[PDB]
Amino acid sequence: MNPKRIRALKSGKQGDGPVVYWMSRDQRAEDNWALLFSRAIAKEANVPVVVVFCLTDEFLEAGIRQYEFMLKGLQELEVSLSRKKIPSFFLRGDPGEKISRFVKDYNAGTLVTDFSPLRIKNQWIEKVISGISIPFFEVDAHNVVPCWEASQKHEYAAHTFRPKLYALLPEFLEEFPELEPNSVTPEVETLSDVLETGVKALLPERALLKNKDPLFEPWHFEPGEKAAKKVMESFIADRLDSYGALRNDPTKNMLSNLSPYLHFGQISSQRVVLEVEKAESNPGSKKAFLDEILIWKEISDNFCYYNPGYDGFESFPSWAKESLNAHRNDVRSHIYTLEEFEAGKTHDPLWNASQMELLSTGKMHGYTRMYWAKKILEWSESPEKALEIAICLNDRYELDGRDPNGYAGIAWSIGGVHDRAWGEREVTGKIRYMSYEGCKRKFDVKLYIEKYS
Numbered sequence: 001m002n003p004k005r006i007r008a009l010k011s012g013k014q015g016d017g018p019v020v021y022w023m024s025r026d027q028r029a030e031d032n033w034a035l036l037f038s039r040a041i042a043k044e045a046n047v048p049v050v051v052v053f054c055l056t057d058e059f060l061e062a063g064i065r066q067y068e069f070m071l072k073g074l075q076e077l078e079v080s081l082s083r084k085k086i087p088s089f090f091l092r093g094d095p096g097e098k099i100s101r102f103v104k105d106y107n108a109g110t111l112v113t114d115f116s117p118l119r120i121k122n123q124w125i126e127k128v129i130s131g132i133s134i135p136f137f138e139v140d141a142h143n144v145v146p147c148w149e150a151s152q153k154h155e156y157a158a159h160t161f162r163p164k165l166y167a168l169l170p171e172f173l174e175e176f177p178e179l180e181p182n183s184v185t186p187e188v189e190t191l192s193d194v195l196e197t198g199v200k201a202l203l204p205e206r207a208l209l210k211n212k213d214p215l216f217e218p219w220h221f222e223p224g225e226k227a228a229k230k231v232m233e234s235f236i237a238d239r240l241d242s243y244g245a246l247r248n249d250p251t252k253n254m255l256s257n258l259s260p261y262l263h264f265g266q267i268s269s270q271r272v273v274l275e276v277e278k279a280e281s282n283p284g285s286k287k288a289f290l291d292e293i294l295i296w297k298e299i300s301d302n303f304c305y306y307n308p309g310y311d312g313f314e315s316f317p318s319w320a321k322e323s324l325n326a327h328r329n330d331v332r333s334h335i336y337t338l339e340e341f342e343a344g345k346t347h348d349p350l351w352n353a354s355q356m357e358l359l360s361t362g363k364m365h366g367y368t369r370m371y372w373a374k375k376i377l378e379w380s381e382s383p384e385k386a387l388e389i390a391i392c393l394n395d396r397y398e399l400d401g402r403d404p405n406g407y408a409g410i411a412w413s414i415g416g417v418h419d420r421a422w423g424e425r426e427v428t429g430k431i432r433y434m435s436y437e438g439c440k441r442k443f444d445v446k447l448y449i450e451k452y453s
């Protein structure tokens, strides 16, 4: 129980009632530092722990694909916590109003939440802080090393973050203690009803193809804590060996496929790292994978935490802003609208195939995501419009979207964040370029195109 994982958001007078874990980013019962710390505080206070989750008014900004994935997981999660005699309460509405009222109505003693560096979570925290008078803590349950501990500032390159993060692994990479149940069960609607009404409100915006059939295929990723663990186990046993060599080949399914579970916190990345470390396979594949789930994932939290404008042009490095500004008035070879990008109606079949994989499976292959976002920059009127188009499509259709990895990955692609300068080109400037011919030299683009008609 390392105290460096928990931060005080507001000191107050501890009440004589239950400790409330405001679950948000880490929707799992196992390997959850936020829930474990909440249980430890409740034990010291001779009081039980409860879990509250807020179903917010912003689910209508995404799709059925993300809403169902999350709620099906929460249905399984409610059963798991019940076995630990830990009740879960699901509120519908604004977390500022709903959690303030819950704290007062249930006489909460202490409030705990998990850590997310996203703007919308900071918005909720501000409203909640002004509506309560009990202590308020946040716990980094998503990163192996607490975000505010790994670095005290924005890191501009992976190679300046990698030694810092690795130097702290011996202290923060540790096993998880078992979640102890409440001593006795203590003293707002069913999840299937909230799922039905939510789906009914999202249906007019469901992504469809010409014959009114739904585009999304929900059988690619089963949601939930139990399914995440099987995905992790299959990756280590069947795919980890070839990951180093085939991670950039979109015609092979050699990625871990963990990002939807990681995004919703249905599995702990620290759990994955522990299991990968103790697995014996190709050391280069182990190094490459750990680089992605440790360095690149946690530097994305670092990017959003230390850059208030992480989703804006202003957070790009100066060399990239000056380069993109110098080519603002370059004639673009193509300009597509948001609707043409969305439907996959560009002149590029590779880009079109990547958009179709996004539309059908909700998870674009990691390599084509780089090509996909860089062409948006190339075929947009300005870098600002490219940012907004890329964020729109990513957050609307990616199961792992609305995520620090998304804004950091898009800022890498369009603005060179966590990248370096390359040869100067028109339109794109010194931003790393990815040509259609370059992709043909790295994988069989025809198979990828044919797979997503």
Ligand SMILES: Cc1cc2nc3c(=O)[nH]c(=O)nc-3n(C[C@H](O)[C@H](O)[C@H](O)COP(=O)(O)OP(=O)(O)OC[C@H]3O[C@@H](n4cnc5c(N)ncnc54)[C@H](O)[C@@H]3O)c2cc1C
Pocket (backbone or CB within 6 Å): 247, 255, 256, 257, 258, 259, 260, 262, 263, 292, 293, 294, 296, 297, 298, 300, 364, 365, 366, 367, 369, 370, 373, 394, 398, 400, 401, 402, 403, 405, 406, 407, 408, 409, 410, 413
């Ligand atoms: C334009 C763009 C948008 C992206 N949007 C998202 C997003 O919305 N959500 C998201 O989780 N990732 C995003 N990424 C990062 C990355 O593409 C995906 O995480 C990766 O493809 C996820 O599939 P996987 O779990 O099977 O990958 P794996 O290859 O098995 O890697 C495992 C984990 O390492 C992390 N990781 C891998 N690559 C990156 C990266 N470039 N940056 C940060 N973390 C990484 C992820 O957590 C990933 O789950 C984006 C990248 C780009 C270039």
